[PDB]
Amino acid sequence: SGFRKMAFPSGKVEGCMVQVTCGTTTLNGLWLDDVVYCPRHVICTSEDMLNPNYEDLLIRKSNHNFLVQAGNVQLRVIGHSMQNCVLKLKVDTANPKTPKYKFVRIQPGQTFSVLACYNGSPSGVYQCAMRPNFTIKGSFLNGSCGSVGFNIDYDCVSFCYMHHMELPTGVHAGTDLEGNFYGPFVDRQTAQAAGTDTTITVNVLAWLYAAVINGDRWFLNRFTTTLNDFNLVAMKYNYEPLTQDHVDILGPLSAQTGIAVLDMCASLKELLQNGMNGRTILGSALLEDEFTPFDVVRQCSGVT
């Protein structure tokens, strides 16, 4: 028992981290097979980050201008290309530590582990969620660009995020491994509206099921609700509307606890309307939305 904000083991990803330097800028790259993937703003100076013309900037760069270091050894760059907001630097050596991998675009409300890196060196790992407004609430400093988000299914690493930018609001924005930004964000140092975020309802419900499984049951009540009634409450409290698809993915947790999904919704409804009244759930004094039903199942079952 016990419930933690657990990340996937980061080893498979540490083996792919490299340092990419171009001019005066240094950031992290992801070496998979004979390709190193990094944010394309590695080619910019601070001056041209106000409105960079990336295609023009890249034209002033040759293969020898991208300095790729894997630990202490230099990789020989034999090709470069820009795909959306990422650069793909073809090297002459395949990464001997390339794990089985996929490049996947995650859905908002899904979770992933981030391996925060500086100068191609890993500093830590943490679990986070793609917010409904496509930002992530990460922990990133200058130099962390190129750090990646991922999920792991047994031996396969699904890369889903690459860090690029910190918004003036302190929240983070990035791309999938094809360089497409999640959200409306552009790689320019300009004010950008993140947009109204919402609470991931299905995740709060999944975490309520994890609380019941791990002992915390004070919030369970004698009530039930309907999807319509629940959604009126979710509307008022800026929670994502609950659909039959969400109820279906909560099936395994509903079957594990014997608490019908609509009964758990009525518990969430009372919690939203009355608050915690100074109590806690799984050591938290607020409703946690960064655990999917899949995460709750995985953590409470022990999948490796």
Added chain:
Amino acid sequence: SGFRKMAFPSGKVEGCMVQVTCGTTTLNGLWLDDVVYCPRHVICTSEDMLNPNYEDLLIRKSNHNFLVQAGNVQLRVIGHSMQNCVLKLKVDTANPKTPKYKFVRIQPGQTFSVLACYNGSPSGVYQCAMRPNFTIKGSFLNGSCGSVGFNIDYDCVSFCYMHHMELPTGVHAGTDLEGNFYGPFVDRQTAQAAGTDTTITVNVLAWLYAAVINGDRWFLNRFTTTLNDFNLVAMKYNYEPLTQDHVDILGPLSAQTGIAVLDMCASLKELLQNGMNGRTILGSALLEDEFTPFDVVRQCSGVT
């Protein structure tokens, strides 16, 4: 910016994880050099876990009875010995992936990352603290025994914890890498008093400094306090008494923010006396005590 419950990258530790089987019991082991370290209750059946005589049980076991599997390959056991509550199984092959390491006994209130493992396979990593009562609030299921806690200083891994037992209260108990239990816990299936836990005051203060650094400053007030006055409040709220040593380790954070340690204490005092009033600090609706001043410095500076 942003502040997360970050764990150290787990790669160096994944490379040491093995499966240890003895009789019907299977748990995790830690392979460092030519030695595999695991909890000694690997030799017990459920029956004798009520009051095991480990010395007698171990006598019925030969080197061939300890089945050690590193991934898919079997390790040849050439020696076995019990040291307090751990078994040291000498193998004929040094772990090619043994990182630079140390075995350290951590102090209560210090933090470490746990690599939760099942059948010698890693499932996830999370950060936690040794509570003042020597328990850890982890996330562990049956089979997780042998999972280890650690800290990493650049290339050196300081192993500090090995998981052994879950108390009926849902909290976890374990040993250092010399098999000595943290706390009064014994490896027997019997009721064991964890004891009154307290809030790690120096850590809450360090996390308040991290909140100021990362933008959250609503809790800062026009007041100051003395160590004596603060400790009267800390007493009432079951917080560890603050000493000059704690104030000294908070020096770097005090210098970073320009907020004197006793001024930050007065902010904590007001928070303890008035509560959060429905507000949050670094996304939390409660006072967080699982980040040391060193953790706050490391995360806010970017140490790899």
